[PDB]
Amino acid sequence: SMFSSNRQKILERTEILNQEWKQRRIQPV
Amino acid sequence: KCKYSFKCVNSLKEDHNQPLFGVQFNWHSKEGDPLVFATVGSNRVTLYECHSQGEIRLLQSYVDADADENFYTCAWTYDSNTSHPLLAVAGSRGIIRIINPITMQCIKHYVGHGNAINELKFHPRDPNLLLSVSKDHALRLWNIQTDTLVAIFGGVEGHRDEVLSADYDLLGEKIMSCGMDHSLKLWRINSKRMMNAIKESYDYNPNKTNRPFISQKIHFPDFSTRDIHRNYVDCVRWLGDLILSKSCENAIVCWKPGKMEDDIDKIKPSESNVTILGRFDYSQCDIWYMRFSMDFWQKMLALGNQVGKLYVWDLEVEDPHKAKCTTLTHHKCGAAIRQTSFSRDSSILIAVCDDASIWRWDRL
Numbered sequence: 001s002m003f004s005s006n007r008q009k010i011l012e013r014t015e016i017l018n019q020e021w022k023q024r025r026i027q028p029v
Numbered sequence: 030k031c032k033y034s035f036k037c038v039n040s041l042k043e044d045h046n047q048p049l050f051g052v053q054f055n056w057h058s059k060e061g062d063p064l065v066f067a068t069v070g071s072n073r074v075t076l077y078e079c080h081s082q083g084e085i086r087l088l089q090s091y092v093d094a095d096a097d098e099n100f101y102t103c104a105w106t107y108d109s110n111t112s113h114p115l116l117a118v119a120g121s122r123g124i125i126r127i128i129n130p131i132t133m134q135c136i137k138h139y140v141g142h143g144n145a146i147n148e149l150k151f152h153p154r155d156p157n158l159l160l161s162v163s164k165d166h167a168l169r170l171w172n173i174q175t176d177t178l179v180a181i182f183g184g185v186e187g188h189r190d191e192v193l194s195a196d197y198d199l200l201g202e203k204i205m206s207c208g209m210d211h212s213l214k215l216w217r218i219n220s221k222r223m224m225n226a227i228k229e230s231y232d233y234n235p236n237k238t239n240r241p242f243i244s245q246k247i248h249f250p251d252f253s254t255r256d257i258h259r260n261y262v263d264c265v266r267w268l269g270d271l272i273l274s275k276s277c278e279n280a281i282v283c284w285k286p287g288k289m290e291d292d293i294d295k296i297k298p299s300e301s302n303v304t305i306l307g308r309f310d311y312s313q314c315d316i317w318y319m320r321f322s323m324d325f326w327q328k329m330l331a332l333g334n335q336v337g338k339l340y341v342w343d344l345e346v347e348d349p350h351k352a353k354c355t356t357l358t359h360h361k362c363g364a365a366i367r368q369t370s371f372s373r374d375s376s377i378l379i380a381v382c383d384d385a386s387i388w389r390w391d392r393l
């Protein structure tokens with residue numbers, strides 16, 4: 001479906017952003 | 030069916046008693062770090078920390094030197110060199126301020142918008158690329174490292190009235206904007222023209238040249254439709270390759286440019302068709318300037334109404350009707366909910382109102 005296909009796109013793309021976030025160490029506020 | 034259940038654990042009312050227009054958790058903070066968020070209202074920016082047992086700890090307050098400033102929005106970033114958190118705020122003045130959240134000091138500001146700023150958004154891959162949407166009918170892209178205006182999105186086929194919202198897609202290849210002209214416009218920023226314009230802004234050196242940097246003027250969008258809503262479009266966000274936008278119709282329309290099977294990256298600028306995929310219904314949200322929000326993993330959608338109700342939907346449910354979770358109400362929460370923010374891990378939902386009140390809903 002369009003839904004399931006759109007869902008995997010979100011999964012993969014949020015996973016790319018999440019990995020880049022994990023590699024970062026932003027100082028506390 | 031929806032799984033998500035929440036519990037209202039705390040509330041507070043800010044001293045100025047003015048409406049709170051925006052709220053944002055800082056999603057750049059590292060796993061473990063205290064969950065922080067900022068709220069904006071009047072000429073104030075206030076930081077809070079979320080502790081156990083629904084405790085909301087006030088950290089710092091920023092009061093703008095200009096008493097007549099009315100902040101409408103904030104966005105979090107980080108310095109790409111020092112890893113230090115940064116916060117951009119803007120409103121009625123049309124002046125963007127970069128604040129050091131730790132000291133509440135205005136580090137730098139950007140003038141150029143001829144009218145109020147409605148939205149600020151930082152690029153999802155580049156912490157230096159800030160987009161601002163204004164009442165002056167344009168969107169502007171800034172490189173806050175080199176202090177340059179990269180591009181202005183408007184003109185001949187740009188917005189014909191105040192721009193209200195915009196959103197970068199997950200990877201930051203394209204921006205969707207929307208406004209009072211009832212239209213939703215697509216602006217690709219991964220085009221050779223724009224990718225080079227971004228590089229140029231990084232190469233700019235004011236101590237090595239006398240000529241000021243030349244911004245790009247993007248007069249033509251890559252897609253434009255006025256066929257989703259019959260009135261003003263005050264909020265837009267990307268849902269994968271689909272769009273989520275709202276008007277005063279008490280529904281968030283889910284749509285895509287072109288036909289059902291058309292690829293977002295193959296949509297020609299002249300595309301005349303638009304496919305409506307569904308609708309997220311609610312009520313009592315016909316007033317202007319009411320924004321919806323999503324959690325990081327785009328699994329939950331939240332929107333507050335004019336009477337203090339917080340609607341939440343499960344974006345993993347295919348039909349938008351059997352996706353609606355129990356509405357988050359509190360008999361004491363009665364003013365308009367302007368904006369919501371989920372914490373990075375989606376454990377907390379904060380809501381801000383016209384009566385200066387903050388509301389903390391913790392997931393069960």
Ligand SMILES: N#Cc1ccc2nncn2c1NCc1ccco1
Pocket residue numbers: 050051101102145146147148193194263264317318319320367
């Ligand atoms: N929230 C808010 C807000 C409130 C008053 C107001 N007057 N001019 C612009 N204003 C806002 N702008 C933020 C915005 C734009 C679209 C959705 O919220």
